[PDB]
Structure formats: C-alpha cells, structure tokens
From a paper:
The semaphorins are the largest family of evolutionarily conserved axon guidance cues. The semaphorins signal through their main receptors, plexins, which are single-spanning transmembrane proteins expressed in a variety of cell types, including neurons, cancer cells or endothelial cells. We determined crystal structures of Drosophila Sema1a1–2, Sema1b1–2, Sema2a1–3 and Sema2b1–3 to a 3.6-, 2.8-, 2.1- and 2.5 -Å resolution, respectively. All structures contain the sema domain composed of a seven-bladed β-propeller fold, which is followed by a PSI domain.
The monomeric structure of Sema1becto we report here raises the intriguing possibility that semaphorin function may not be restricted to dimers, but also monomers could contribute to the complexity of biology mediated by the semaphorin family. In class 1 semaphorins, two distinct loops with no obvious structural and functional role are substantially extended from the bottom face of the β-propeller, β5A–β5B and β7A–β7B in Sema1a, and β2C–β2D and β6C–β6D Sema1b. The latter loops in Sema1b also showed a higher level of fluctuations relative to the rest of protein in the molecular dynamics simulations. Intriguingly, we found that the cytoplasmic domain of Sema1b lacks the sequence previously determined to be crucial for reverse signalling of Sema1a22,31, and therefore, Sema1b might be incapable of mediating reverse signalling.
Residue numbers in the entry: 42 to 146, 162 to 569
Write the structure that this text describes.
Amino acid sequence: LQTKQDKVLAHFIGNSTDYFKILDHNDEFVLVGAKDVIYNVSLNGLKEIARLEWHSTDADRELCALKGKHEWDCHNYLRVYALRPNGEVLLCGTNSYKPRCRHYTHAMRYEVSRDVEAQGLCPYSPAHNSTYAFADGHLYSATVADFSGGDPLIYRENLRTEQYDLKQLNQPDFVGAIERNGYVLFFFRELSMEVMNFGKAVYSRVARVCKNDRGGPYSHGKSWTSFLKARLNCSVPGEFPFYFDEIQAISPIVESGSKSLIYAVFTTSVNAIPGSAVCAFNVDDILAAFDGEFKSQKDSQSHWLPVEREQVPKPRPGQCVEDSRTLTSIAVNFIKNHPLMEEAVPAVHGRPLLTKVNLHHRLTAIAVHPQVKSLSGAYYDVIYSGTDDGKVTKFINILSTHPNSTVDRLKTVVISEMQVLPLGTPIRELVISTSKNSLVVVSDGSLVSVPLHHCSHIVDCLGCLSLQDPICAWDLQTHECKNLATSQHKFGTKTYLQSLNSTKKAAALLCPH
Ligand SMILES: *[C@@H]1O[C@H](CO)[C@@H](O[C@@H]2O[C@H](CO)[C@@H](O[C@@H]3O[C@H](CO[C@H]4O[C@H](CO[C@H]5O[C@H](CO)[C@@H](O)[C@H](O)[C@@H]5O)[C@@H](O)[C@H](O[C@H]5O[C@H](CO)[C@@H](O)[C@H](O)[C@@H]5O)[C@@H]4O)[C@@H](O)[C@H](O[C@H]4O[C@H](CO)[C@@H](O)[C@H](O)[C@@H]4O[C@H]4O[C@H](CO)[C@@H](O)[C@H](O)[C@@H]4O[C@H]4O[C@H](CO)[C@@H](O)[C@H](O)[C@@H]4O)[C@@H]3O)[C@H](O)[C@H]2NC(C)=O)[C@H](O)[C@H]1NC(C)=O
Ligand SMILES: *[C@@H]1O[C@H](CO)[C@@H](O[C@@H]2O[C@H](CO)[C@@H](O[C@@H]3O[C@H](CO)[C@@H](O)[C@H](O[C@H]4O[C@H](CO)[C@@H](O)[C@H](O)[C@@H]4O)[C@@H]3O)[C@H](O)[C@H]2NC(C)=O)[C@H](O)[C@H]1NC(C)=O
Ligand SMILES: *[C@@H]1O[C@H](CO)[C@@H](O)[C@H](O)[C@H]1NC(C)=O
Ligand SMILES: *[C@@H]1O[C@H](CO)[C@@H](O)[C@H](O)[C@H]1NC(C)=O
C-alpha cells in the first residue's frame, strides 16, 4: 500500500478475453465494443441498458482457425460504430479475421439493413493499432487491408494511400483520428526514413487528408491527392533535447479559451531510459505545419535540404481543390513523392506538461476536464492520465510570468495519483462525465467508475487545500470541502479557501489551526 486505492463507485466486469473498446460516449451513456457483443452502458451505476450480440459463423471461425490463429482471435470483436445521417447505425467487427460491416435500424431495434465486406474499413484483430473517424457521412479508416498485417492504409470511398510505399506509411500504429475544418487528421507512430542510415527509429506523426478529395487523373483516381504528414515534437528542450518519440494516446479536441488543443501521451523508445510524457498541441500549429517546406526525397546522399520553393506545383499540394481530378500528374506525383513536411509540430509551452522518467510504469491513457474555474477565478484544464500499472494521475499546469527571471517557468501541480485498477491490469482508455462527476477507467475486460473530483470524499481542511484541485475549496462557515462546479453557493464564496500557486505544505498553512 505505497499508493492509496481510489474509492471505486461502480464496476462493469467481463472476462479478460473480451478486449473492451469504447466506440461512442456522452455524459450519460457509453458504447463498449467487445468480443461478439457491443454494450450500451449507463454511466450513473455502470449498469447495462441495451445489448447487441453478433457472433462469427462456425464456417468463419473454422477458416479463421485454419488460417493459423488461436481461439481468442477467432471471434467477432466489434470495433467501428457510427450514427449515419439517415438515422441508421453502422457496425463493423473483426469477425474472426473476416471483417464485415452492417447497417441497422422500452424498445430495442435490430434489423440488418446491409452486410458487406470491411476490407480496409475495419481491422482483422482486436489489437488496438487502428482507428477511424466518421466525417460528413463517410468513414475515414486507418488500418490494414491484408490478413497478415503487412498492408497499412488510410481509406475512404475507394481512395487509399499508396500500397507498399514506405514514404507515406512505414509500419504505422494508429492512435486516433480527428475531424477538423474540412480535414481529417490522423495520429500514429511509424518507422523513420528521414534518419540518415534509415535506422529503426520510431517517430510520431500527424497526417491529414482533404474530405473533398476525389482522387487524381487516370491511374491516380484511387489514391489521395492531399495526403501530408508532419512529425510531432514532444521533447524536453536543451543543448541535448530529450525526446518522447512514441505517441500512445490522444484526447479529443479541447477548447481552452480561444485555443483548440489536443493532449497526447508519449513514451520513450526501448534504448532511452523508460520515460513517459504528456504534451499538448495547438490545432492551429498542426495545420500551420502543412504550409511549410516539403522534406525532399531521401536521396542517396541523405543530406538534402527541403524542396526548393520554386519546385512546388502550381497550386500548393495539400490545398483542398474543388475537383482534384483536374490536378496534373506532375502535381499528384509530387505530393506522393514528398508527403513529409520539413518542420515538426511544436508542443504548447515548448516542453511536456508532465514527464515520468525512470519509473516502473508508463502512461497509456489521457482525458481532460477543460476550463475548470478556480476559486480565484482563473480557468485550468484538469488533465487525467492512466498507466499500464492501473494508476490515475490528476494534474494542472501553472505558468509563471517573471517569478525570478524573464524566462517563464511552467510547473506541474499534481493533484493526486491513486491506484484504480488491480496492480497488474493496464488502463486502455479514460472517459469523463462531468455532469455525474465520474471518471470511467477502461481496461481490457472491465469498466471502473471512480469520482472525477474527490471534494466530497475529503473531510479534513488540510486535505482540501493540499489536494490543490482547482474545483475543491474549503468553506470556513461549514467544515466541508465543497465542489465549486456542482455545489450551490447562494451565500457566496468569500469564506472559502484555496491555494493552487503554492507548496502543498504552504497551502495547508492557510488552513486554520
Ligand atoms: C523539437 O523541439 C525542440 C525544442 O524546441 C528543438 O530543440 C532544439 O534542438 C536543437 C538541436 O537539435 C538545439 O540547437 C542547438 O542550440 C544551441 C544553442 O543555440 C542558441 O544559442 C547560441 C549561443 O549560445 C552560446 O553563446 C552565448 C553568447 O553568444 C553564451 O552566452 C551561451 O552561454 C552559449 O554558450 C546561438 O549562437 C544560437 O543562435 C544561432 O542559431 C539561430 C537559429 O539558427 C540563429 O538565429 C542565430 O543567428 C545563430 O545562428 C542559438 O540562439 C547550440 O549550442 C547548438 O549549436 C551546435 O549545433 C550546431 C548544429 O550545426 C553547430 O553548427 C554548432 O556549432 C553547435 O555545435 C557544437 O555544439 C554541439 C552541442 O553540444 C556539440 O555537440 C558539437 O560537437 C559542437 O561542438 C563543437 O564546438 C563546441 C564549442 O562551440 C565544443 O564544445 C565542442 O567540443 C565542439 O568543438 C544548436 O544550435 C536547440 O537549442 C533546441 N531548442 C531548444 C529551445 O532547446 C528540436 O530541434 C525540435 N526538433 C525538431 C525535429 O524540430
Ligand atoms: C443507449 O441507451 C440510451 C437509453 O435509452 C439511449 O438514449 C436514448 O436515445 C433515444 C434516441 O435513440 C432517445 O429517444 C428520443 O427522444 C427524443 C426526445 O427529444 C425523440 O424526439 C426521439 O424521436 C426520434 O425519432 C422520431 C421518429 O422516430 C423523430 O420524430 C424525432 O425527431 C427523433 O429523431 C427519440 O424518441 C431517448 O430519450 C434516449 N434516452 C435517454 C434516457 O436519454 C441510446 O439511444 C441508446 N443507444 C445508443 C447510444 O446507441
Ligand atoms: C466468462 O468466462 C467463464 C469461464 O469461467 C464462462 O463460464 C462465462 O460464460 C464467460 N462469460 C460469458 C458472458 O459468457
Ligand atoms: C497494426 O497495424 C500495423 C500496420 O502496418 C501492422 O503492421 C501491425 O501488425 C498491426 N498490429 C499490431 C499489433 O501492431
């Protein structure tokens, strides 16, 4: 008991073989894609509401086992859900390495409207290496097209990345896909070509495609004409920067004031000492990287600089043209030859928001409660991160202006680090329901509900101030640590105490004797 165990509110337990995956969630209900089943689960008590079962035919499982896969692989793990603009429901599952998609239509309705192949639209294995995004009525999938797992692609409406071309994709493991401003952004880690000796170094990338892409002319009609990617830069600055090059998870786009943010979790490679980090990226900075120079093709010398400014095609590559079929073969071949941008995307504040180095666990999940108003009146993003150990870490960031020198100092206020899952089980995903004050930890075979904020669970004044949660404040009128977002303060907060910009011992000093 070196770390305290968190107060588990509710639990939804399945077998370890289930390999749960969250498909859709809001503040009240969440969908869980599992082995042969997808679950509609209410968030107040983690109680099941609606169940849809879908099993592989014995013909499908037999051929799957004949294909050389084990029993746990020869099932139907549901991995793709989308609410179509017709009110229909789209469901796709692995189906024992024979992926298929279906359309569906108090009261539970389960009528199979359609059933068709899902090659390139759905993964073959429950492995969490692939992602998707349903944007403007189409499915933008990033997965493998083959049974062996050696043909990665990004696909949508018969438009795919170049097959067996390592310049666009080099053994990628996808971690997420976000729609934004007429683009679809993909986040993944892959092998690096830009290194001089082509060494097996993993780099983290953000890639984008135009949604209005209609392909190129002639043989380019089945390939993207707007595929670009840039490296993500999550590193500790210095004379010798310390990089976290393997992205592991991302959060949805967070709205923090006038800025749109994406929080991501990075780990170090196997050689550098084991390390984890949380970096945030500005969406305006991500989109700006695709306005820069193009990294030239890895020529034999490999010391080549970015492409000459006069060598880029007449319209800029990656710019969403109305009809991309009118583009020339020279312009389409160019963006196929130079899909990698020269400059990398810088992280917000130019450094990780949290680092974890030389520890017996790595960060795995991420979730954000944005713009929590502190007692003082400032707004902070409360960031949640999970580990392969089963722990959850709350923290906020405070940036100091001229505290000692003109250089700004960014500090990390760790709110709590508690054990949530059994000490062995890793944390796959994190879902936040602010209205129910619930953080839902997701493992392979369980959902666990723990309080999003422990204001109502602490009774001591010293603990209410030492917690340094921007949402918990201590009322002196009534000895009760109150939640500023949920609890009602009709008599005002003038008698409240909170200290976020101090030491955890300096905060408890403000608390009365
Ligand atoms: C992801 O994001 C991260 C975070 O943002 C990025 O991280 C960056 O990483 C790069 C490298 O990848 C770093 O570049 C190095 O920067 C430092 C510092 O440069 C600044 O400061 C210089 C002056 O500092 C010195 O002088 C002042 C007084 O003048 C003194 O007070 C101070 O104490 C200090 O002593 C400036 O000169 C420099 O400005 C220059 O560059 C500007 C930008 O181009 C330009 O605007 C200026 O006009 C000017 O041209 C800047 O302000 C540098 O130390 C370092 O320089 C080394 O590397 C280059 C590479 O070609 C080389 O040409 C240099 O000669 C130098 O190489 C020596 O140092 C190496 C470092 O140890 C050493 O390994 C070498 O062997 C070599 O050493 C030889 O000479 C030295 C004596 O000089 C001797 O000790 C050796 O034994 C040997 O004889 C780099 O420029 C960035 O700092 C870093 N950024 C941050 C914010 O941390 C990362 O790039 C991003 N990744 C991606 C993919 O995007
Ligand atoms: C998982 O479980 C929850 C719990 O039931 C479930 O949430 C429910 O969603 C349905 C919609 O699918 C909600 O029912 C709607 O209520 C609105 C009232 O505003 C009605 O207008 C809706 O009618 C629709 O269809 C009509 C024609 O058929 C149209 O005229 C109309 O415009 C609507 O389009 C519909 O009755 C229901 O309120 C919630 N339940 C709760 C408690 O909120 C969820 O759908 C389940 N499945 C998932 C998430 O896939
Ligand atoms: C979970 O595994 C057990 C094996 O001990 C099995 O009996 C049970 O049926 C499984 N769960 C479901 C929902 O089938
Ligand atoms: C995930 O997809 C990549 C894409 O190339 C593939 O190489 C890999 O085998 C798949 N599975 C895992 C576990 O990475």
